[model samples]
Target: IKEMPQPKTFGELKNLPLLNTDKPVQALMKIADELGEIFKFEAPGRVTRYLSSQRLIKEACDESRFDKNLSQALKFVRDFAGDGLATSWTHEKNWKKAHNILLPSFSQQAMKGYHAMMVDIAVQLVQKWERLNADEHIEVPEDMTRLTLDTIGLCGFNYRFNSFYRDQPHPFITSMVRALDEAMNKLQRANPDDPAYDENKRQFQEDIKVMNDLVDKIIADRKASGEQSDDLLTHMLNGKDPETGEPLDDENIRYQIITFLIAGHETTSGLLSFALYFLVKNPHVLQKAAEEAARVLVDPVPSYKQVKQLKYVGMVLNEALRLWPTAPAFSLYAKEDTVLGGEYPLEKGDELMVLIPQLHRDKTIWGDDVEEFRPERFENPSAIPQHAFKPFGNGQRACIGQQFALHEATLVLGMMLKHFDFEDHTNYELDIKETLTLKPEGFVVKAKSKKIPL
Candidate 1:
């Protein structure tokens, strides 16, 4: 109790530096094993933080409420998208106002409305692959990125990217990639003198201008049309501050549009890509996905309401994301002087980042075979074994887009599996590199249309 890594104080996260021995992933695993559940990064002067345990994580959500602010790490991402000026994204008061109003836009009904666009994007990818011979390869991450961009565009802002059909990356997506990579480069302490940084900065500026101008044009065009439409853009404009009866302003609305464009598209693209990797690696799970898709695509395009009902499709995504989360480090801040683990508590204005990769792989929490990949584990959502398996993250602050993300991934996976057969001739492991989210690198696969067994 008196021992293990402890910090003398708790205030600034800067005091608790990253573990010296390891880089990002190793640092977490080492800290968890050596220091126990409440391990603190050596503040030296000591104002440390946390990584949760099964009991602690479960209680944090079930037994208690905690105030979690946006990660300071998120600032780099926010600045790239629209600077910290947009109140809805960069600050709390407007985040709540915007979040509450926009919640309905991701609803099942909204998702149902968004469903055709979702399948169309998936089908577009399927058709692209259909053009190729069985042995031909595609850079999956890039393709999925294109599909997601198009999906977020039409569904979220009523825009069209036509990314799959394009030969070069769209300027917006190119800048989007550079912004994410710049954040990573900054994280890794990539050499400051690198020429890439200057070019990256220039591209980021140009990208934001293009995206901002597009959003403004959309809003302005709608005003001229004197027309009504059902989509996220309209829902956001109609969202009023409950007390003040104020409509969402143009700047804040654009921030939400960009947020969906970035967050919604990027995460789900990674999910679909990594998810396909898992299906390729394991035969039974591959069969499960293809088989489920086979049944559901009886009419080629069912209601996403019904498509989302595919149990096997849901499980594979659950398992794949379990292995490779879009956002691995989910955290919380003390909104108003809060306590954790009841008696053992920190003072006001404390923040703790939960290292989800380690938590999900915890041999103790997830059983001895925690390292294994198995989608059947999630067969019954009611029987989900752990509160520790937090892919969408924890609490009210958990990802609002999870259902949409899942529905999109699930629907896409089911459709692809039904129509296509995939093979990894390289026998590649899911090689990964970091950006704003974890991305698969060195991953290539060959796809062929399904050949039904006689």
Candidate 2:
């Protein structure tokens, strides 16, 4: 057995300023750089070990040895997500059942079912951008949020936020965002005696109440309509777990909807936002991507097959996920008494945070030019080490929305590139803001229509 590095109280205090800021991930990465491959940090009521090296991360990925563990933030997330797939503890039955029943919704077959709806949302984005004055600065991440959220709303449950229709996001989004913020804040303070605690609790419950009502309305609408549309809501309503022969109850179905809205949209939107940043920064890559889109998307509406042909667009996305990895980290714990990397001994429930950003940028795995955005790096997947690239997390409990997200991203990016040329009107520096996912803050750009107005 070997000892993992533990930062002294002095080192801990020194990093507090960075840790307290919005970009705590950068602070954590700095700590990782100082502490080496594996290190432990002390927080209230928990000891979380951050794993940085490819070898250590790969070892931790082994399902027999480790299982997904909910962080305190995620435990608070359970208040909203319930026993839905993303926030559920490993032993929860809902995760497995819902995952199996909803698995096909993310399949290639299901993607075809989703393609027209995806195009509808992409067209909404394109039309909005098209209508904007050429010099009108576009809010990259905010628009991306609208695009992804609307896409999932339609495809996931056959509902539409129609986010493009208004200056504000859907009321559901406002409430959900507030609710999530409340949950995370409560996780840190969690003091009943605090003067503001009850008021905060009241607001939290009301915010969540709005979310619950909206989700319940969606489910009720589906039931009352009897539309039988082939989507996630329909599947959850009708599909049963093969192994258990049980259907997801309405309450659990509501959680799944909330989970999809949160997990499915935020990560993909960040990917698009970051991809756009890189594309604007690297003119050559942007040109190459637009050329691919121009080559493939000859029609106003891109077909599923045509979207699939945007191979370079796919690479750009892969590279973006590598660099930014919207869902930046995941939690895991040793399943039983075992040694990690055959060195650091672990007990059951020893929480480990797999830092995807650090792992993705590891010089040992990605070489000296790791920081550079070169989509060509992903052209050959076999050349990279196994388990080294995990923008989507690891193992069975990994993101089930992988295909859904990539497909949506590729289509949207490809179509946007084909229809317009984007310029960084503001020359905004990359400053990421995290709201359960990472997105560029205050990123603005201008889009010049490539098509002559008819």
Candidate 3:
């Protein structure tokens, strides 16, 4: 057996496949136990915090806050942390209120607008590909992020950020990437025994402040205009919490906007990037997905209902998400002293980190052939348990943007397959790097136009 690289941190530790697809159940458990010994002693709270945040978003989205005022609250949370808005934008509470108020509208004008934007972008991308020819592939990650940001701005805030077609990247995007980089670096540098841990935390605080100020300015401008836009901002300003009858304020609105932007942008972009990578790498899967799209869509473009019928496409996306979850690791803080896995005794404030990458590759839960890119495994997913497969996190802290990401990805992928055939130019292994989210390093693939049979 070859010697494995020594991991300096938990992030590096997660990159190693302790339990590959071929490993036996006992071997998997043994590896888990070995990894647990190291992880249990260190910070487990980070996993808990991440999972809790995910659940908050999921609940809020499920509650309809996303539907009613998509931009203000979700976007705010994406921009700034939930802690940014103290009182009014209570995630759990406002989510319930927002859900009841917004669900009907989600399927109506907002969904229509979102779908339209996707189609418009797809058309533009196809045109660009035709002009550029097959030599260069479109950068799907940047394009998708810009597209989602633009959609959120137009539909959520009634303001155009001009992110999609802009010649340069947006400041918010740049800051977010920097902030995540700084946080990752700081986490890597902190000494468990050092007193400077508290002082070192100042960098994240400053970065978050910049994010909060950006959202604050946007909220202030919206409030001052007295404009009657149907976006989330209007809902937050005028709408009330049904349970408390308290009005949604600017600070709360900012939190939601930040959340939406961060959560919505990265996940969707990463998913698209991986989806294209797989489709290019595996021609059979690409053909099957294209066939599914053609059979369901019939037309050059697919409607929302038609998109739903493309089950194979959905499976491909799900498998990609399973293989490369955007938020690869979830963090949790133990509220009280509790026993975890029966053996690991978690002290109060102890951080529990669940490596999704590790869990996803576990042979016990996903079977021996887990490494294979088989979408059929997802078709009959009855074999897998509830908590076993959690690309969106488990329990209460799942992602609010789960449905949004799925629907948007399906539409975008379906449209892309209908018009283009992707080819892998680089034989790159899955080179993943974590920043704000888990992302592929230098993931570029070329797309050639597929001719329609006359």
Candidate 4:
């Protein structure tokens, strides 16, 4: 990129020397070791930078003072997120209050109830796969999307999306999917060239209303009928922050629901789908995973504690996660000069993106064979840095549902081994399509049942 006399945003780069817009965009997305810990690129009026060093990221992640990217990308989401009270937001005044209120739902004790439900739903998925004929090519992402949505519906509100059995997506499913797709694709695009809001912005608004109002309507119904269920919504409505002893106001409570609905299934589905892609691609890895499942999960089922006990299974997941982090990056704003990676001093107005994917594959930390898919690396920790692999993020703002996803994924992998063996993924390659989350694009794989002999 060629720079101009002065550049404030991408807007200023208009007149400068440049290739087509797509060229620059593609080049910037790529990561290289030469870029060093901080990679700075300037174009016309726009200047943006990326941070790929685990050392710098570790220091930044540990601090709560630095504000999140605080991008306008999420502007329209205020209503859906209840004015920044969503867990997705960072450094909100009410974040702590809302977070405190919602904590009970994700607590260890709370996860116990959710595990049985998750396993029952996984069983449904196993049955669906079993029904497929021999040599049948399965659309993994599609199936995973349905399974997760159905999971959130039952787990959060005690409602049924029935995404698995239904031939069509439910209204809520349709609306949320559309809105999130639009949000992920368009919201985070900071290029000044792109319009702040487009034609789909209105459609995005309408779909979000449909999603948010459904949550509101459910709450309305609950109040009118006085129905009692041991669900997240029940807990949210009655629960209060220990500090203030006050329940979340109407807006923030709905924000929590929207956050859970969007964040809960989206990340888990991505992690599982991509992990499946890795397993199908590497035959040896797949067999080893199956072997681990057979030995530990002979019943082909795992409790919460048992899920953690499977070392090799855990390694496979850890390796897969390193390959393609579910939440690839979170934004950071340097609050004045601060310690980066505890060594580099970042200046003020330093906007950096934690390149999780790049950081995980650093040639130094992971060695020359960083690109290889080897789960065994995780078996021996000496080679890896503690902060080098952070798919769930680090410190105070880390994903609250980390345990839930790990256990869910581990259990699913084990169960899948017992029920089905995977093969023939149509020349399996990573065609990553990223929005708010990253997923395989139109990636299809074939499945053959290991049991119920065909």
Candidate 5:
């Protein structure tokens, strides 16, 4: 452990560029490739060890030895939204309270209730794209973001962001987007008196006001209406922690609402964006997916039953997540003094960042074509090693919205493919944009109506 690879010279450590690098994951992976699976990085008052292989990650995921640690980006989110479920510490009371309250909401039975609402959002997206002239190209990630943000707004809280109808998205989205982008800037080393820093701080606070006001209004209106809908907002408002019998405070509810929009939409939108990118890049895969869509989506509106039957579509989503996990990495800290991989020594509080891309693309399990966009790899899901496929993260701290995202993605992909033929006019090379989550930036496609007649 004392001999671990790290910067030799003071200048090298100072210029490591871990914070402001355009592709931080790529840079980390390059270091791992050269230095070995486990390497250490030292910054003032902070130490992080990067783990490359799935085997070590699998070991780290053990709850008895390690627990979820909020990254710097999530800490910025905590500043904006308070300690909502995703950004809260491991043992925080609300994580359990909110998790329990929301568990049934994400269940299969509850998903059926959310289906029509999801279809409503999906229809809005189809109409928006259909209205586009043949010469016009739609920005893929931006529109996918609209689709997902609207879905969560309506399905979770019965609020309508109505993102597709607006010239820009709702004011809430505008502010939240700016707020999240600024969080990345917070990662860079900077002086407090820097003019850019001053401006960023001002904008960030203003953005938080916009976000808080929107959520407050949603809660107030729902409370005033006296309408008890079986939705997330109502659930949170009315639920008690089953074990403790404590209700979430009004302030916590606001944090949870913003947390849902932030956590729920970003990863799903990225999943859809990456899925679309792979489809356009691989024509045969697109054809097969469209055929599956044709076979499964025979109804005027896709039913929950039909969505569950989208095997090929599900596999495609899996492969896309495999190649480019939207929420790329998660942090875990040692629970106690322990030896990682049965060799490397670690203290009780040591933190490790699991580089998910390296784990997902391991040459041994994925073979020589590890970088290829092949959905067939997931054809037999049982064959893949445990903990190897974690685009949604791991343990009890894993994404509570996992099934929600999958169902939403499957329905949107099935419906869109059934209705339109997508072609990339730009012949775009892959370029990723990083905020709290990773997305394909500036990728656009023109959708010609298949005239399936929704």
Candidate 6:
């Protein structure tokens, strides 16, 4: 038997070769089925552990905790956990308090910020396209990343990282990506009795310090300036929790802000890049997306409501996410002694891995033609099985940015299809590398202007 990759942290859990096979769908089903036996048996204990995390457990009682605050907790988990189970007791109260204090600001800012950032990026794209005569050979992923980082800075924290220039790379962005990469590598190499475990812990702390200190500086500057803007940072700073009437402190605000930056920018850029690659590969799909955009976007520019109506474009985005989930897999640690999927024995520290790449492509769930790029699969999502399509995960920890991602993806893709006729000269298969996120390795494409009547 081939040795299965041992996942000691979440990042390592992501890198396990879960999605790179012809029979990935079937393979995942077998694993999930086997795991389900253990999972079902240990579910009662699992529920208890989940409940112990007040934020996640409340959902079982049909109570909704503040999602904005939950974002902070999730962010901490993402930053810290490479593959194994994380210790929750230390951060539980802090997470709860952070979520409550930061929820209102997150909702308000995310609503306005996403729209403005999309428009800004669309405008920049048009300008760049025009400069290159719509036939410019540009690095779309890099461009999208810069634009996204700038947007995250402007909207997420009321600061400017100014990462849009082609030649320039922001240190903070670079460091964050590096930290996540290093963390993922550690997770891949870890085992049950690894001696290097303490070193991995140190690395995580150091990386968090680097990210946290940067956020703290921004928060302190905003506070010192005594300035208020409609951005998320301002709202987080000034807004008081209705329950406690207490304003978010520096640490809580910093945590939330960094969470938004990391989660918001990376995933959105990856989705855009993958969607672009898919459209370039399949002209028929591209044409369908363009047609939908044309009908909905009456003006040269599309309104938010108009963007929502681009069904084909939405389908394309959904399909891309299915193929290349930003955060590919998630693992939940067995809180107490438990069993999962009836077969996999779960101890308190044992990690229960949900291989998303396999799950998304499962033949039983997604049909035999799961490998085919069919956006129509999402038109009737209920046609697929429950828990089979978890690009953003499931249950209480589903991505809060789902709506935000959909809205942004639709607007950007619609506008791109409406404005440009993109085609790739090379039919290079996407070279993907797994990290904290799934990233395209050496991903490149070329585009040209379509002679479409405006």
* Model 5, span 199-219: residue lDDT tens: 778888999999998889888
lDDT of 4 by residue, 181-255 (tens): 665454335463556556677777888788778888887887788777767777877888898788877666667
Pairs that clash in candidate 1: 9-47, 43-46
TM-score-wise, the better of 5 and 6 is 5
TM-score of 2: 0.96
Candidate 3 — which residues are off by over 4 angstroms? 1-38, 43-79, 82-113, 190-214, 224-230, 335-337, 347-349, 451-454
Clash count for each candidate, listed in order shown = 2, 0, 50, 7, 0, 19
RMSD of candidate 1 to the truth, in angstroms, is 4.2
Ranking by TM-score: 5, 2, 1, 4, 6, 3
Q: Give Cα-based local distance difference scores for all models.
A: 0.70, 0.86, 0.59, 0.70, 0.86, 0.60
TM-score of 4: 0.86
Report the C-alpha lDDT of model 3 over 110-177, residue by residue, as the tens digit.
Answer: 55545655555555555555667548766657766666666566556665666645767677766665
Q: Against the hidden reference, what TM-scores do the models get?
A: 0.87, 0.96, 0.74, 0.86, 0.96, 0.75
List ranges where model 6 is wrong by over 4 Å.
1-91, 102-113, 133-135, 188-213, 242-245, 335-349, 451-454
Off by over 4 Å in 1: 1-27, 30-36, 42-48, 62-65, 81-91, 188-204, 241-243, 336-339, 342-344, 451-454
Pairs that collide, model 4: 9-45, 9-46, 12-45, 13-44, 13-45, 55-341, 56-341
Per-candidate RMSD vs. true structure?
4.2, 1.9, 8.2, 4.3, 1.7, 7.5
TM-score of 6: 0.75
Ten contiguous residues minimizing lDDT sum, candidate 1: 82-91
